[PDB]
Structure 1
Amino acid sequence: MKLSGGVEWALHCCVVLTAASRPVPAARLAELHDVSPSYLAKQMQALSRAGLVRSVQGKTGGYVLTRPAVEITLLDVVQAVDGPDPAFVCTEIRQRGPLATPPEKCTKACPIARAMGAAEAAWRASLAATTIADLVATVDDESGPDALPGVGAWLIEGLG
């Protein structure tokens, strides 16, 4: 199964933005992670279209989270970058060939499609149960309480 390569970068960007007390340009986030500015901007633009970040305009501008970290799930961020479409796409092959499912018996989804859907629901539910706030609390505990504030200070420095 393939997942958008943007997900790692986008989740890291959401975590460090919680520590920024002012808007952070995409270029500064890109410098932090030593990644293509253009590539990271595309991920921030996907987060913007999903209403998770807002681009504040001006030379004092850059990205901010649109709501508290506790209200942003990992599923919110992953679906922003990877998309909401199901991984398993049923193309109704049960309706093909000489012993095709009777048309009146196609009101329920294929049992195979339903089983694949249940697995995707388990993946989504796992991501929905964790927030950016949860990731921050883990980083505080594992890296220490000054790790993310240090990143935050670095991200906003030179602006004020």
Structure 2
Amino acid sequence: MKLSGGVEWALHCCVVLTAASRPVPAARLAELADVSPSYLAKQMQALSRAGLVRSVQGKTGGYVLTRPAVEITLLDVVQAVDGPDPAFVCTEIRQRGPLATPPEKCTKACPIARAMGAAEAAWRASLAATTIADLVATVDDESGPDALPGVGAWLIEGLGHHH
């Protein structure tokens, strides 16, 4: 099992909310992603349960990040969607068979499990060391300084006005 499809979506969602820098209603995010408002709202639940997004009420209400983009790491978003479980799971096969390691000697993790855990720690360190602010800065530098502001304006234009 690799990462679920929700990780790609949730990372893009955090970048687009930073671009808006004002509450974005479910309907406007849903239009941007070409899905229904009710489907978008269901996907947002992973980010709201993790305390990364909240809902603002009122006529120009909608979703906002709960803290600045520099305080949201890629690891925060990945764990919001796919949870905290490591990729490698030790099933304690060293406790099997006629030369089984007795449980009283199985307090410390298997050296194999520890090496796999150290590799996972490098993956998590890389995700923890990168922020939503870094992604926004790279999009700015490569798409131009007008690209994300354009997305932000499109999301919030006309909110609280009836045409």
TM-score (norm 2): 0.90
Identity of aligned residues (%): 99
After TM superposition, give the deviation of residue 40 of structure 1 in Å. Answer: 3.3
Runs of 4+ in 1 over 6 A off after TM superposition: none
Distance change in 2, residues 1:38/1:25 (3 Å): same
Tell me the matched-pair count: 160
**CA RMSD of the aligned region, Å?**
1.6
Structure 2 gaps of 5+ residues are: none
Q: Deviations over 1:14-64 (max 9, x none)?
A: 001012132112232122122454443333111111111111234432110
Q: Contact 1:53–1:66 at 8 Å: present in 2 too? A: yes
**For 1:39 and 1:101, how far apart are their aligned partners in 2?**
50
After TM superposition, give the deviation of residue 83 of structure 1 in Å. Answer: 0.8
Q: Contact 1:21–1:156 at 8 Å: present in 2 too? A: no
Which moved further from structure 2: 10-19 or 29-38?
Answer: 29-38
Matched, 1:73 2:73: yes
Distance change in 2, residues 1:123/1:39 (3 Å): farther
**For 1:106 and 1:58, how far apart are their aligned partners in 2?**
57
After TM superposition, give the deviation of residue 119 of structure 1 in Å. Answer: 1.4
**For 1:36 and 1:7, how far apart are their aligned partners in 2?**
19
Q: Contact 1:17–1:65 at 8 Å: present in 2 too? A: yes
**For 2:57 and 2:91, how far apart are their aligned partners in 1?**
44
Distance change in 2, residues 1:49/1:146 (3 Å): same
Distance change in 2, residues 1:84/1:38 (3 Å): farther
After TM superposition, give the deviation of residue 102 of structure 1 in Å. Answer: 2.0
Distance change in 2, residues 1:51/1:155 (3 Å): same
